[PDB]
Amino acid sequence: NSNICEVCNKWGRLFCCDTCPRSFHEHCHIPSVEANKNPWSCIFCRIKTIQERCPESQSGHQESEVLMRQMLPEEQLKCEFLLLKVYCDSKSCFFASEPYYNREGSQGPQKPMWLNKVKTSLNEQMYTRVEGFVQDMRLIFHNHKEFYREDKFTRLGIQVQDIFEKNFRNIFAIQETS
Ligand SMILES: [Zn+2]
Ligand SMILES: [Zn+2]
Ligand SMILES: [Zn+2]
């Protein structure tokens, strides 16, 4: 197994995957690493297993179809992985915890959103469709772009949103387009 956390890349109290070499802090893994279970498979392993069980799940899809899907256990997992992949980027640290807004010439967003809030929402099963998860994810970056305006700090929003969108297309097998 790896000696660092796959998500944050630090050492510490790590839990090791029994089916691949990745390791996780308890709360870096989404969902949080499970109390017992021997062996234990990580979320990278569980996502691979869905794909292997239905190779046609990697033929292309329409985003509109994807969003209307109900949050049954496989869609739930896939959003928990998408979220995980965003937290793998160190720049996710700017979007993790609840923000606040006090900048001359800007008003704060009507509906603030942050990654830990999206994490809690998933955990408490508050999304019924993929749509709900993907709207909040996108809201994070949109709020950021609107608030920081012409400041160069807006670019962090663009960057982390590009990580979200590439990963969403991949995980949900969106049909490739030019
Ligand atoms: Zn970690
Ligand atoms: Zn694994
Ligand atoms: Zn099949």
Side-chain angles (χ1 to χ4, degrees), residues 67-132:
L67 297 179
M68 285 315 291
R69 291 177 196 176
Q70 290 182 356
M71 283 295 264
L72 298 180
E74 292 200 340
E75 300 318 308
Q76 175 76 34
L77 197 69
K78 282 182 171 198
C79 295
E80 293 165 344
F81 187 50
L82 180 43
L83 188 45
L84 181 123
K85 283 288 189 154
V86 175
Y87 280 99
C88 301
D89 197 275
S90 64
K91 294 160 181 275
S92 72
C93 81
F94 296 107
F95 303 103
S97 86
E98 181 177 355
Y100 68 89
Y101 295 98
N102 196 359
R103 179 191 201 247
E104 179 174 322
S106 278
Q107 272 303 307
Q110 301 309 301
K111 181 171 171 196
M113 187 52 58
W114 54 108
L115 293 170
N116 295 345
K117 191 170 171 76
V118 176
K119 181 174 287 201
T120 290
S121 289
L122 277 172
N123 177 254
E124 287 160 16
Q125 295 151 320
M126 299 295 287
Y127 308 114
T128 54
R129 287 156 204 274
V130 168
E131 185 173 44

Side-chain angles (χ1 to χ4, degrees), residues 82 161-171:
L82 180 43
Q161 173 152 31
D162 192 55
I163 293 305
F164 177 72
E165 300 291 358
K166 277 186 204 258
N167 281 280
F168 171 70
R169 292 189 304 257
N170 176 252
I171 291 171

Side-chain angles (χ1 to χ4, degrees), residues 30-36 38-95:
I30 311 165
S32 281
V33 174
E34 296 74 14
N36 201 288
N38 304 64
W40 177 74
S41 278
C42 82
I43 187 156
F44 289 83
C45 288
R46 294 166 62 176
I47 292 282
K48 198 204 301 282
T49 295
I50 313 322
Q51 293 172 26
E52 286 171 359
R53 288 182 160 161
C54 274
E56 73 272 33
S57 72
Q58 304 157 285
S59 300
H61 300 84
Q62 294 303 105
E63 185 175 302
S64 45
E65 183 260 313
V66 170
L67 297 179
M68 285 315 291
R69 291 177 196 176
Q70 290 182 356
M71 283 295 264
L72 298 180
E74 292 200 340
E75 300 318 308
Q76 175 76 34
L77 197 69
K78 282 182 171 198
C79 295
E80 293 165 344
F81 187 50
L82 180 43
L83 188 45
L84 181 123
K85 283 288 189 154
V86 175
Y87 280 99
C88 301
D89 197 275
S90 64
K91 294 160 181 275
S92 72
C93 81
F94 296 107
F95 303 103

